Design a protein around this motif. Structure first.
Motif, short mmCIF file in Angstrom:
data_model
loop_
_atom_site.label_atom_id
_atom_site.label_comp_id
_atom_site.label_asym_id
_atom_site.label_seq_id
_atom_site.Cartn_x
_atom_site.Cartn_y
_atom_site.Cartn_z
N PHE A 10 11.98 -4.07 -4.50
CA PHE A 10 11.65 -5.08 -5.49
C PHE A 10 10.28 -4.74 -6.05
N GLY A 11 10.16 -4.67 -7.37
CA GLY A 11 8.86 -4.64 -8.02
C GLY A 11 8.35 -6.07 -8.21
N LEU A 12 7.04 -6.18 -8.41
CA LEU A 12 6.37 -7.45 -8.60
C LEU A 12 5.70 -7.51 -9.98
N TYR A 13 5.83 -8.66 -10.64
CA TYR A 13 5.48 -8.80 -12.06
C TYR A 13 4.82 -10.14 -12.32
N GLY B 152 2.25 -3.37 -10.07
CA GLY B 152 2.02 -2.12 -9.35
C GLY B 152 2.44 -2.17 -7.90
N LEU B 153 2.86 -3.35 -7.45
CA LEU B 153 3.30 -3.55 -6.09
C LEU B 153 4.83 -3.52 -6.00
N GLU B 154 5.35 -2.74 -5.07
CA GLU B 154 6.78 -2.67 -4.85
C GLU B 154 6.99 -2.71 -3.35
N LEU B 155 8.02 -3.44 -2.93
CA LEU B 155 8.27 -3.65 -1.51
C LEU B 155 9.71 -3.28 -1.19
N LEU B 156 9.90 -2.55 -0.11
CA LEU B 156 11.25 -2.19 0.31
C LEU B 156 11.67 -3.20 1.36
N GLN C 139 10.20 -2.41 5.02
CA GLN C 139 10.18 -1.03 5.55
C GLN C 139 9.06 -0.18 4.95
N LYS C 140 8.62 -0.49 3.73
CA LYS C 140 7.62 0.30 3.03
C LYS C 140 6.96 -0.48 1.91
N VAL C 141 5.69 -0.16 1.65
CA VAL C 141 4.95 -0.74 0.56
C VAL C 141 4.47 0.41 -0.33
N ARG D 33 0.49 4.70 -4.40
CA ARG D 33 0.31 5.17 -3.03
C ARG D 33 1.17 4.36 -2.06
N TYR D 34 1.62 5.02 -0.99
CA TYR D 34 2.42 4.38 0.07
C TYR D 34 1.55 3.80 1.17
N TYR D 35 2.01 2.68 1.72
CA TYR D 35 1.37 2.00 2.83
C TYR D 35 2.51 1.49 3.70
N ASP D 36 2.27 1.41 5.01
CA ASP D 36 3.29 1.01 5.98
C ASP D 36 3.57 -0.48 6.00
N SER D 37 2.58 -1.26 5.60
CA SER D 37 2.71 -2.69 5.60
C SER D 37 1.72 -3.32 4.64
N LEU D 38 2.01 -4.56 4.27
CA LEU D 38 1.06 -5.37 3.53
C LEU D 38 -0.24 -5.57 4.32
N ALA D 39 -0.17 -5.53 5.65
CA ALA D 39 -1.36 -5.70 6.48
C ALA D 39 -2.25 -4.45 6.47
N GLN D 40 -1.63 -3.26 6.55
CA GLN D 40 -2.41 -2.02 6.48
C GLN D 40 -3.07 -1.92 5.10
N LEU D 41 -2.32 -2.29 4.06
CA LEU D 41 -2.83 -2.30 2.70
C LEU D 41 -4.04 -3.22 2.55
N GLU D 42 -3.92 -4.43 3.08
CA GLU D 42 -4.99 -5.42 2.98
C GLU D 42 -6.25 -4.95 3.70
N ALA D 43 -6.05 -4.40 4.90
CA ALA D 43 -7.16 -3.91 5.73
C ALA D 43 -7.84 -2.76 5.01
N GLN D 44 -7.04 -1.85 4.48
CA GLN D 44 -7.59 -0.72 3.77
C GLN D 44 -8.34 -1.16 2.50
N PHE D 45 -7.88 -2.25 1.87
CA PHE D 45 -8.59 -2.83 0.72
C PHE D 45 -9.95 -3.44 1.13
N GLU D 46 -9.94 -4.22 2.20
CA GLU D 46 -11.15 -4.84 2.70
C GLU D 46 -12.15 -3.79 3.19
N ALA D 47 -11.63 -2.65 3.69
CA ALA D 47 -12.44 -1.51 4.17
C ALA D 47 -13.07 -0.69 3.04
N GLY D 48 -12.76 -1.05 1.81
CA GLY D 48 -13.40 -0.46 0.65
C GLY D 48 -12.75 0.80 0.12
N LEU D 49 -11.58 1.15 0.66
CA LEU D 49 -10.91 2.40 0.28
C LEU D 49 -9.96 2.31 -0.90
#
Ligand SMILES: *[C@H]1O[C@H](CO[C@H]2O[C@@H](C)[C@@H](O)[C@@H](O)[C@@H]2O)[C@@H](O[C@@H]2O[C@H](CO)[C@@H](O[C@@H]3O[C@H](CO)[C@@H](O)[C@H](O[C@H]4O[C@H](CO)[C@@H](O)[C@H](O)[C@@H]4O)[C@@H]3O)[C@H](O)[C@H]2NC(C)=O)[C@H](O)[C@H]1NC(C)=O
Ligand SMILES: *[C@@H]1O[C@H](CO)[C@@H](O[C@@H]2O[C@H](CO)[C@@H](O[C@@H]3O[C@H](CO)[C@@H](O)[C@H](O)[C@@H]3O)[C@H](O)[C@H]2NC(C)=O)[C@H](O)[C@H]1NC(C)=O
Ligand SMILES: *[C@@H]1O[C@H](CO)[C@@H](O[C@@H]2O[C@H](CO)[C@@H](O[C@@H]3O[C@H](CO)[C@@H](O)[C@H](O)[C@@H]3O)[C@H](O)[C@H]2NC(C)=O)[C@H](O)[C@H]1NC(C)=O
Ligand SMILES: *[C@H]1O[C@H](CO[C@H]2O[C@@H](C)[C@@H](O)[C@@H](O)[C@@H]2O)[C@@H](O[C@@H]2O[C@H](CO)[C@@H](O)[C@H](O)[C@H]2NC(C)=O)[C@H](O)[C@H]1NC(C)=O
Ligand SMILES: *[C@@H]1O[C@H](CO)[C@@H](O[C@@H]2O[C@H](CO)[C@@H](O)[C@H](O)[C@H]2NC(C)=O)[C@H](O)[C@H]1NC(C)=O
Ligand SMILES: *[C@@H]1O[C@H](CO)[C@@H](O[C@@H]2O[C@H](CO)[C@@H](O)[C@H](O)[C@H]2NC(C)=O)[C@H](O)[C@H]1NC(C)=O
Ligand SMILES: *[C@@H]1O[C@H](CO)[C@@H](O)[C@H](O)[C@H]1NC(C)=O
Ligand SMILES: *[C@@H]1O[C@H](CO)[C@@H](O)[C@H](O)[C@H]1NC(C)=O
Ligand SMILES: *[C@@H]1O[C@H](CO)[C@@H](O)[C@H](O)[C@H]1NC(C)=O
Ligand SMILES: [Ca+2]
Ligand SMILES: [Ca+2]
Ligand SMILES: [Ca+2]
Ligand SMILES: [Ca+2]
Ligand SMILES: [Cl-]
Ligand SMILES: [Cl-]
Ligand SMILES: [Cl-]
Ligand SMILES: [Cl-]
Ligand SMILES: [Cu+2]
Ligand SMILES: [Cu+2]
Lengths: 708, 705
Positions: B171-174, B188-192, B206-208, B213-229
């Motif tokens: 699913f894409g998000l709009y 720009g967000l798509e979720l499997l 299963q995938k973000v 870019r690919y991320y394993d979860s919405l949580a890894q994505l959020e953490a990586q965002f907060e981490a400044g990357l």
């Protein structure tokens, strides 16, 4: 109540003035072409000499003085030791003072006299020969087969073309047909064809080289007559009268309820002034080459020029058959002339009743200009189909759409049996569409022998002969400037691993893009694959960083072209190509010539030559489109071939030319939300239609004018 | 100034009533059905057996039993399955026959069932309630997200996975854009979403994929965002112009041209049957396969038993996983089901006849789509035939072309398919379809060049092909048909009268195609210029009476046969096929193909084997489509100009002469006659006869669901 010029063809006055200047300079022994003999000097045609592009554009762009208004006269120089045909530029208009022989400059030397079109008077002398000196000798046979009488003239001839088998021949196969009252004579071949050698400058010297009658060859009419009288010719009796579609065009069914009619509830939304058309979206100039037919110039969409010239260039019919006439017929119609053979448009049949009808003026085979009444028609047509549409039930309830209305410019050439319909259609998306239709009568021949290889029997004793139709257009697009490139976009599938699941395969769909740099790369032969997106582009980009382009998209089921080994193929070698993109050159104005028909063995213009080892990356380009189809005649071509399914041509569509679809800005566009009243006038302009279309359609009295 | 009729309200109710009585108490409204419920997915007409239908229509035999097919989702059991059930007879139902095993050799596996509206609701609940809040910080920063807010919407893709049995959807998000297309506003967000499990609590991401870019979860994505990357490109959620609304900023000017009937309409619409002075037929809409027409008679003679849409396919390319793996098989949703009201005066001419459609799909009670069909006559503005004679005899003979049109429109997510069937006065039939509406789009990142053009800011218009498959059951002058191929060829020969010279002798070639394989034409092959089905009997002129198939298609390169899913729509590979019409081969596709193309429920290529097509009941299958590389001019909508594809069915030695010779509207006059007198030319009579003010009914709209 009642509901509310650089490119112009020469006016009556202008034609008159050129003729007046010619009837002074060319000497006093100059004969009116309508009665001219081969040994005479006569003026065959006078028409506009299209201006040179650079001077044309400089005038239109920065208001430089226009280039001289010039005419081109084709003169037949018969009254001399070495006869020729000459091309003469006369100018300037309105008051001519010079005349310049451009024959040599254009062709490297004289235009040989046997390349001249057969005159109306020449056909008359041929008939004078056939009916007075030739058919009388077969009086016996003809009396028995063909309802012949002493004077009579109940038979008629029809020319074929080309006229012979090599350069310098002028021997035409004429078929003979019952002179049918009020309907097509073409379906009534009596089975006699005559090879007439009418090359000599003295008609007294003309001969019959050969005779064909109901399947058999004869050396002469006398020989045929003597064989008939001796008992050795079994005559099939072809009747000269009958009823139904093979004899008539009058429907026996009385009219019933009236067909739907279109009208402009607030008046027409476009103007025609001289040769210029203007609507809120489109501007252009239309006209008619005497030989090459319908043309449009200076096409501007919302003020921006897209096209310098779109023009018909040539039309071609190649025949097969059981008889000599149809066996060797290859019509190059410009040799006769698409303008010259343009016919009046019947108001309400040929175009919608409420179209604007324009007259055409010409000076062809005469000494005074004439008129074809209602030769053009210009109209808005509601297609009865949306341009764009979206009904949304998902998350947000709204509808948005627009009904498509197109603006159309049409003329019709009737050459012998068939009627060509030429359309240019102007779309509100900014697309331009060219189509042509071949309607009217088929050529047929007398049916004899083994049917199957040459067409189908279509009526009593008649074979509808197999043939191909082709036409060639010049499309001089100037996409956001003179300087253009050619792009080829298409698709491909590349198998690769699924990124998020590598042990699985997917087929990755991708766009391929190739710049076509040399002309050869942009020459596409009939029968070969062309890239799905082919477009000419500017150097400059749209808002989104892509070269601004116009796509050429083809609608054609092209017939196999005449094989290259034929010695006459080069006389219409444009037929081999679906598409070609060349550098536009002042010295390559046409892909064909009025002179090709009677000598394709030594063509006056050979389109092949245009395609050479030449760059098309950043040049003024012109595209050349061939459109066509095979036609195997069949019963439902009787009495006429219908236009349905038989419309071939092409689209010119914007491809990253604009920043968004221009029709978003349409005045006629419709939008409403699910939470507003679509029945209210403030919301929907279509809701005011019941009220704002409650007048009685304004309709002129029916008038038809033109039977020469 | 009725064998083929879709089931009516009363009939749908009756079958529905009968099903609730017979299927037992375990039956739940499909509108709110959990995956493990028993529910009725749909009820619609079961087309009548051809032999019996013809027996009734031609020999006067008793009408065949009026029947419905109901699709049931049996989720409330140890081995979940979906079943097709024949219910009859109507009006008062009496039997229920399970035809699943009979049609398919085995049970239909449950993962084939189309995704329910309720299933889409649960997916959104999971996404917005359990999933997205985990990336709250990022969404606040990029996407104007607010806690327990739904300013974003989702859009499904298909198929859902990589192999048989999967049910995982990207699913894409709009941005939920108000009053315009949300499709041009990918965030720009798509979720499997893995939603295979019958219990939604056990569903997973299963995938973000976020902004390239690919991320394993919405949580890894959020953490990586907060981490400044994570560099977040800011996509705005409001604007003006074509990529934001459909409303023209330009006031209306003079009214566009309008067509009216000077003496009233010239055709009647009665139930599902149309009749005009030339044409007779019956039209309808399959819930899944779409528009169909039946029993087409020209001037009393049947040309076609059935012409029906079968499937529509869109194959996508792209930068992002959603686009990348999208292959819509639109019957898995339903061209009927997603039929939309036609807006009078935009979708069809203002004065067309409009007709409602009734359906029972994913609910307990039938509903209506108002103005689902339009029928109308249309002056083409072009002559059907014309001859002006200046030669020997001076006369004119012509006829303006008026056509009769049946039109329907289906909106499946972003696009709007326009399905036209056009009946010509020459006896030709024309099928055309157009794809308009919104393009599907993705967020723009990386190397632009290979997956489409940028069409607006932050937006890639994703490359894709369109295709549709049609069933054309011509019965040319009877059931028993043959297939002929005609074409052209040149043979070098010496000129009979001048043997020293050569000519190129133009000839017709002719070939009988005796086996199915001979009449199967793959995309990209050349086909015979004249291809036609013919009777065995001749017209007056000794020629077999035939109707030819003329195709107008710029068809895309089909999905490569090497793709394990290609068999789910194997009709894509053909331009044209001719097969024996068989009762067990009624469709080239199936509603169950979309969610399991890897194990197709119907595989079209199976219909083509070594069988004869010489004097049998034949059906032609026609594919039409094009490649679509989106461009700026597709914004806001893709226009229909030159983007119509399909085919013509044209008479070829069928009649003894062109039927239009006998037309009531044909015109004729000579140069000695009075072209302006009314007794001579009924067109000089029209100015005064069309001096009426046209009766336009007050504008109404079909509505929104
Ligand atoms: C697309 O095209 C236009 C113009 O198209 C022509 O450009 C030329 C260069 C050829 O490639 C021709 O075939 C194309 O059709 C572009 O606009 C032109 O851009 C060039 C930039 O190089 C301009 O030319 C330069 O002009 C300066 C002075 O203004 C000169 O100093 C340069 O000349 C030196 O370099 C050459 C190298 O061969 C030497 O021979 C000379 O002696 C000089 O040392 C240089 O040529 C040109 O004037 C521009 N023309 C116009 C009308 O604007 C345009 O940029 C491009 N647009 C896009 C978006 O791609
Ligand atoms: C094709 O035929 C035309 C017409 O016959 C040829 O052009 C004509 O050429 C003659 C002689 O050059 C011109 O006549 C006059 O000749 C005298 C005697 O020398 C000279 O003093 C006069 O000034 C005048 O030129 C005649 O004007 C000219 N015809 C026109 C009006 O163009 C032509 O040469 C032939 N084509 C070719 C390529 O041979
Ligand atoms: C797909 O699922 C359906 C529903 O579970 C299966 O059909 C059902 O099969 C059972 C046989 O175990 C039928 O039960 C029988 O019903 C009659 C009532 O008239 C009763 O007297 C018998 O003793 C027996 O219990 C049941 O009616 C039937 N449901 C219907 C209405 O079709 C089906 O078998 C599954 N598909 C396959 C091929 O596995
Ligand atoms: C065209 O065909 C019909 C039907 O011919 C059938 O004949 C079989 C031998 C076989 O080829 C089958 O496929 C085909 O359908 C012809 O009428 C048939 O033949 C004669 C009549 O002359 C009789 O036996 C029957 O009446 C009839 N058979 C059937 C089954 O109806 C017809 O003669 C023929 N017409 C032409 C012009 O070829
Ligand atoms: C062939 O027959 C036609 C009749 O169809 C003749 O046409 C008439 O000719 C005379 C004299 O030219 C005209 O005044 C009439 O008005 C014509 N009638 C029509 C309807 O056009 C014609 O003369 C014959 N032509 C030939 C070549 O013999
Ligand atoms: C998406 O936005 C739209 C438009 O703002 C919302 O639809 C409106 O919602 C209200 C309340 O439910 C309805 O009464 C209106 O009928 C809707 N408006 C229109 C124009 O149809 C919708 O709720 C939003 N969807 C979400 C939250 O995903
Ligand atoms: C042709 O046939 C008709 C009969 O339909 C007859 O009346 C007519 O006079 C015939 N034409 C001529 C003048 O020979
Ligand atoms: C085209 O042009 C170049 C010369 O600049 C040359 O190398 C080549 O031979 C030519 N190509 C062809 C196909 O003749
Ligand atoms: C978007 O912005 C425009 C002004 O540019 C404003 O008028 C409009 O209401 C906004 N749309 C929505 C629904 O937020
Ligand atoms: Ca060149
Ligand atoms: Ca150009
Ligand atoms: Ca059939
Ligand atoms: Ca088969
Ligand atoms: Cl000569
Ligand atoms: Cl794939
Ligand atoms: Cl499952
Ligand atoms: Cl030849
Ligand atoms: Cu033809
Ligand atoms: Cu598309």
């Amino acid at each position: 109540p009642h509901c509310p010029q650089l490119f112009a063809d020469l006016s009556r006055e202008e034609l008159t003035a050129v003729m007046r200047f010619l009837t002074q300079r060319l000497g006093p022994g100059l004969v009116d072409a309508a009665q001219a003999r081969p040994s005479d000097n006569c003026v065959f045609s006078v028409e506009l000499q299209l201006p040179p592009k650079a001077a044309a554009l400089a005038h239109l762009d920065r208001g430089s003085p226009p280039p001289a208004r010039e005419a081109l006269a084709i003169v037949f120089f018969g009254r001399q030791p070495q006869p020729n045909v000459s091309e003469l530029v006369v100018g300037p208009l309105p008051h001519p003072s010079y005349m310049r022989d451009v024959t040599v400059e254009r062709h490297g030397g004289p235009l040989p006299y046997h390349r001249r079109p057969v005159l109306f008077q020449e056909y008359l002398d041929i008939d004078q020969m056939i009916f007075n000196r030739e058919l009388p000798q077969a009086s016996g046979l003809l009396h028995h087969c063909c309802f012949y009488k002493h004077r009579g003239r109940n038979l008629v001839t029809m020319t074929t073309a080309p006229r012979g088998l090599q350069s310098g021949d002028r021997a035409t196969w004429f078929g003979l047909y019952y002179n049918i009252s009020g309907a097509g004579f073409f379906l009534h071949h009596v089975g006699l064809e005559l090879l007439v050698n009418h090359k000599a400058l003295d008609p007294a010297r003309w001969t019959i080289q050969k005779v064909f009658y109901q399947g058999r060859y004869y050396d002469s009419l006398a020989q045929l007559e003597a064989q008939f009288e001796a008992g050795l010719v079994n005559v099939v009796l072809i009747p000269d009268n009958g009823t139904g579609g093979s004899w008539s065009l009058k429907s026996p069914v009385p009219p019933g309820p009236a067909p739907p009619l279109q009208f402009y509830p607030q008046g027409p939304r476009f103007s025609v002034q001289g040769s210029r058309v203007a609507s809120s979206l489109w501007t252009f100039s239309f006209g008619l080459g005497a030989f090459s037919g319908p043309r449009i110039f200076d096409v501007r969409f919302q003020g921006e020029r897209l096209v310098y010239e779109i023009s018909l260039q040539e039309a071609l019919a190649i025949y097969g058959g059981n008889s000599p006439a149809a066996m060797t017929t290859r019509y190059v119609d410009g040799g006769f002339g698409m303008g010259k053979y343009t016919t009046p448009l019947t108001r309400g049949v040929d175009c919608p009743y409420l179209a604007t009808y324009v007259d055409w003026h010409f000076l062809l085979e005469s000494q005074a200009p004439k008129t074809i009444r209602d030769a053009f028609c210009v109209f808005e047509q509601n297609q009865g189909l949306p341009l764009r549409r979206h009904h949304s039930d998902l998350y947000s309830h709204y509808f948005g759409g627009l009904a498509e209305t197109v603006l159309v410019v049409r003329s019709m050439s009737t050459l012998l049996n068939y009627d060509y319909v030429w359309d240019t259609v102007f779309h509100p998306s900014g697309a331009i569409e060219i189509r042509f239709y071949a309607t009217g009568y088929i050529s047929s021949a007398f049916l004899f022998g083994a049917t199957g290889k040459y067409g189908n029997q279509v009526s009593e004793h008649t074979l509808g002969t197999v043939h191909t139709h082709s036409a060639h257009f010049k499309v001089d697009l100037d996409v956001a400037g003179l300087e253009n490139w050619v792009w080829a976009e298409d698709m491909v599938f590349v198998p690769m691993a699924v990124p998020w699941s590598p042990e699985h395969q997917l087929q990755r769909l991708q766009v391929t893009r190739k710049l076509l740099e040399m002309e050869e790369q942009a020459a596409f032969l009939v029968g070969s694959a062309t890239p799905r997106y082919l477009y000419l582009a500017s150097n400059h980009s749209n808002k989104w960083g892509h070269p601004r382009g116009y796509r050429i998209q083809m609608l054609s089921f092209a017939g196999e072209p005449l094989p290259q080994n034929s010695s006459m193929a080069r006389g219409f070698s444009w037929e081999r190509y679906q598409l070609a993109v060349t550098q536009r050159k002042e010295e390559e104005p046409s892909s064909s010539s009025v002179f090709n028909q009677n000598d394709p063995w030594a063509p006056t213009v050979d389109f092949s030559d245009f395609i050479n080892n030449e760059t098309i990356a950043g040049k003024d380009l012109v595209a050349w489109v061939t459109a066509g189809f095979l036609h195997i005649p069949h019963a439902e071509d009787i009495p006429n071939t219908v236009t349905v399914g038989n419309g071939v041509g092409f689209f010119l569509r914007p491809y990253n030319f604009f920043d968004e679809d221009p029709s978003f800005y349409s005045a006629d566009s419709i939008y409403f939300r699910g939470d507003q009243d679509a029945g209210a006038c403030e919301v929907n302009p279509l809701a005011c239609l019941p009220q704002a279309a409650a007048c009685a359609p304004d309709l002129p009295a029916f008038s038809h004018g033109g039977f020469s």
